[PDB]
Design a protein around this ligand. Sequence first.
Ligand SMILES: [Mg+2]
Ligand SMILES: [Mg+2]
Ligand SMILES: [Mg+2]
Lengths: 189, 113, 64, 135
Amino acid sequence: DIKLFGKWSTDDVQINDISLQDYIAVKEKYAKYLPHSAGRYAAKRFRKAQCPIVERLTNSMMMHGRNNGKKLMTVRIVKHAFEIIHLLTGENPLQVLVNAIINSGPREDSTRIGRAGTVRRQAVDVSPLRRVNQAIWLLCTGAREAAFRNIKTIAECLADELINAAKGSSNSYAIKKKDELERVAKSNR
Amino acid sequence: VRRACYGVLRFIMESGAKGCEVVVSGKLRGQRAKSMKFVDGLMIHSGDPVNYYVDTAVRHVLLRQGVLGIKVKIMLPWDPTGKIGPKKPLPDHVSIVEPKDEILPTTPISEQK
Amino acid sequence: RVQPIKLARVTKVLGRTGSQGQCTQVRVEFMDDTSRSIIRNVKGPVREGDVLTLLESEREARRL
Amino acid sequence: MGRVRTKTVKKAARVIIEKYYTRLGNDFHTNKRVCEEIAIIPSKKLRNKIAGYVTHLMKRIQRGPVRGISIKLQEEERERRDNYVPEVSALDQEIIEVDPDTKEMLKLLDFGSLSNLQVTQPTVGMNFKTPRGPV
RNA sequence: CCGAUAACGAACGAGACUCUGGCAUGCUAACUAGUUACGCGACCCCCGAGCGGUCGGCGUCCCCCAACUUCUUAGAGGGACAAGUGGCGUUCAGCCACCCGAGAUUGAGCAAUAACAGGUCUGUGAUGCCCUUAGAUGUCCGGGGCUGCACGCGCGCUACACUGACUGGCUCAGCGUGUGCCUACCCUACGCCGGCAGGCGCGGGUAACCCGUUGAACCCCAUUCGUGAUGGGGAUCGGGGAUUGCAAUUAUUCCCCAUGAACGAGGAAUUCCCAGUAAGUGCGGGUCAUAAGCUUGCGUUGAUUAAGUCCCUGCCCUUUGUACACACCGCC
Ligand SMILES: [Mg+2]
Ligand SMILES: [Mg+2]
Ligand SMILES: [Mg+2]
């Protein structure tokens, strides 16, 4: 019905945990034909919670301070990486992306005001909006650092970290920081 | 200076105004110079109405000990509505006009004309 | 041995804490012992009435 | 939350409301217009905060009086009170419980006989005498 | 301000307003703005189509050979200013959410009582006192300097590259500016020569008529590069060509061909910011004979995060204390 980029039908993707069912933004109710709209989403809260997840990607990869208006860079790179993924695993790049999102979203952090042990004092759970926010940020920044001094363009970096996180491989920088945050929090329990 | 400014304040008030402000600056007798402000009545301070309700003037007085700074600020009562007092009264004056009795509690009454 | 990951609906929030807004009291329930709920501090937006993952139930309980 | 104010910025609406007691409501867009053009109030943002609970006042007056004070509240709401003057007497029963002390000092006004003045028995034992101590 | 209430009745700042931003196919009107329809002319497929479509080409105010203001403009208005609902609260003074709506907070101007030995006497023919006043601390002229460099600090700009550079092709803005009192000095189209810098004819414009439909940058799409301090970067450094200036050296500025240094994302610390926001990215004005890494504005692209707190810094009110009152950078 919506044929994302001429393909990748929305009514295929399955999200696992119902603490995220409503908080991933891939589904048909708001299935955009493309991740781009000046929709005043960040004006008030919780609209960006509904902002399509691919739109969040294209708006988050657009972050270095050198590139600051090149959203079209972002959509072209994400479309290329989506094509790359659908080539890599045959299944929906939307599906692999949501899998990486859930598998790289942390749950435990440390935050207090007292004398911090290693990061903070008290371990604390995270609500699944800062969780997915940090997850997509981590994916993006992994892609950026990976393509910084490599011949690989950001398209393939994003693709490979997306696969690595979705499967879970202890090699993508995203999950490699996720589990360290989780375990240092467990130490500061 | 006090007697003179009180006299001018008297005369301005009898001229009829919502208020006034006068400030005298400079060095009086003695070498330490400080101002001293005489006020009466109303004195709006902020927003557009000051541009066309209060008028101000600054004059420098060539005194043997130096110079005297004089500020005067009079406002014009609105009521003339175009005369020496300007029209468009201050917005906090939407005055409630008062009906008549408008009771008429009698029976339905017909008068033909 | 380790307590399983458990889900947690969030009811009315008591309010922020950490004297910076960094944490908030949430009153979660495990949708199975629905008559048992626990006070709990979380970070990030709460979206009153949403649901949250949880590893260890009996972690903390402090009243402001 | 965002539920912390100053009493002073709370001091916002009754500079207006009763002064123009004639044109309020229970309301969201048309006492809006009346509040646009009615004072010297130099800047833009705070129009909503003065005027939010404003029509909540005439909500109140449509269920109860309040300061205010709107000179229309009190005389109407007390004129309603003016009525309901009972036909029968609230005290006309012509028997009244009285204790022996009462009867006897009516005997020092020298009348305890020409009426009903029905006597109730005294407490006798008198479980009154408000308490004191432990044991 | 409710609410209390030895207070009552007022005044200033504060929250209206002014402009700006957000809408009206509602009003008035547009040959210095147009838009349509038409009639032309050129065009294309034409085998014919044909009301197929192209034109920022021409004309429809030299007086009908057509109308209209929608697009643009700017005035009048209106319009957005707690009307509806639910929920919270003594249900009291506002918010939360939702509906609808151009919009449920558009940013600025102003701004009280007082006060600061804050700065300015280099703004003035504003000025007191003092100083100088002919071998002038006046004034003008010539030259130099304000640019000077073992070092330390501030604001910035460019970069450290492949979300890139190079080359070529494509497609878009908005403020605002423009010919002279003195004062000479404007914005510039078009054409010709010169690779460029430029020059020479040739107009238009004192401006919604010309520059200008401001054919902006970023960005767009094809090429090359390949992770090399490399085609990144462009400091330093030679020679040549222009331009303004009476005068250009310590280089006014620009252009060409040359040279290719640090820089491989920076500590200790520290600044700004939350919606067209920060930032990328250009364009105007002032400065200006030549002058922008400055600044003021204008746009273009366009975010992440948060709707909390006193943790640091600091501020307002209330109680407390005190030996302080030049008021804790105090006192002792
Ligand atoms: Mg103001
Ligand atoms: Mg090179
Ligand atoms: Mg004390």
